[PDB]
Amino acid sequence: NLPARICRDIELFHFDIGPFENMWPGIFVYMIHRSCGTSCFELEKLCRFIMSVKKNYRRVPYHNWKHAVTVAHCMYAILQNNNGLFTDLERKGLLIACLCHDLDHRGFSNSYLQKFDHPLAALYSTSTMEQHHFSQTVSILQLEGHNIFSTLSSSEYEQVLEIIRKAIIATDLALYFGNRKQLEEMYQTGSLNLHNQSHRDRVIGLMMTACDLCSVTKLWPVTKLTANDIYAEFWAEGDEMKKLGIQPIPMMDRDKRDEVPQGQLGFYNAVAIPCYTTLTQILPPTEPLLKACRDNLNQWEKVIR
Ligand SMILES: c1ccc2nc(COc3ccc(-c4n[nH]cc4-c4ccncc4)cc3)ccc2c1
Ligand SMILES: [Mg+2]
Ligand SMILES: [Zn+2]
Numbered sequence: 001n002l003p004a005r006i007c008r009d010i011e012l013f014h015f016d017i018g019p020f021e022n023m024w025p026g027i028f029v030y031m032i033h034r035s036c037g038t039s040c041f042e043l044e045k046l047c048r049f050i051m052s053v054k055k056n057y058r059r060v061p062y063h064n065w066k067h068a069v070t071v072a073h074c075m076y077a078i079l080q081n082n083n084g085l086f087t088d089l090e091r092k093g094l095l096i097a098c099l100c101h102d103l104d105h106r107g108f109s110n111s112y113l114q115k116f117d118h119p120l121a122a123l124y125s126t127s128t129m130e131q132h133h134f135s136q137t138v139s140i141l142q143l144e145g146h147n148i149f150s151t152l153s154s155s156e157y158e159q160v161l162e163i164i165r166k167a168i169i170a171t172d173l174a175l176y177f178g179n180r181k182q183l184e185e186m187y188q189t190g191s192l193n194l195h196n197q198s199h200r201d202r203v204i205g206l207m208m209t210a211c212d213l214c215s216v217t218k219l220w221p222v223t224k225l226t227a228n229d230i231y232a233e234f235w236a237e238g239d240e241m242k243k244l245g246i247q248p249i250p251m252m253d254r255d256k257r258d259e260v261p262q263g264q265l266g267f268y269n270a271v272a273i274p275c276y277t278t279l280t281q282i283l284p285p286t287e288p289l290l291k292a293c294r295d296n297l298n299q300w301e302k303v304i305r
Pocket of ligand 3: 067071101102171212
């Protein structure tokens, strides 16, 4: 059962899930129980599922099991602070989607898989890794005793899997730019309609981006340390690009590491700030994410000065 400090602090947008890996499954179950009810899933099935998901995350620097639970926590915080907006099915689906959204990640981008001519790029030409993450999700659900959705009707099963698929695919950051552009237009013209499924899907897409990127919404010590892990992957990919005979983009080139503060500035400006700004416009209770993002932006500016 959850420690008093965790029960309190888990409700903060900037909660960090800690270094104790064995505690993370219980943290996830607690979040499920609080958003979805303790009758939502059979506990044994749920526990079995979570442990098989863990097993299919790799020991990479950033796109790992810790990332999965962290993304799920951010989703929990959004859902908790936006009571009555999302359906029981959406809430279950979105939390499970976040837990599964990077399944079997190798620590390489879609672009690298394409340049490598990896068999996954042949199977899934666009959003390669994300299509794979969804495939892994389905495969796990299909294992004996793992169908946490077995109490749903056939129709609800299909429905939740579609919610999950859309949510996982939305974590392809390539898609964020177009999605955010559409949403911002809908906001400003007052045409955003949460009862319109296509609009609803976009909002959920943006939520998935917000959650995926949430390391930039933590307090500075957490954010600064996390940046070490993301670049560890990117620089390794840069090395691999060099080995293919291809000059990596500066973000992936360890030789350009002194330029990290300027690169961060670019990212906050082009992606992070616009993301949380748009999210806050649609879901005002999510403002703490934007506040923390702006604070981290200032810290990078301070590093530069
Ligand atoms: C030289 C040196 C560094 C450079 N960096 C950049 C942009 O760097 C990033 C880093 C991470 C991410 C990111 N993508 N998805 C989640 C994250 C993330 C996760 C945790 N913390 C920060 C970002 C996006 C951009 C550009 C040019 C550069 C040139
Ligand atoms: Mg991903
Ligand atoms: Zn992710």
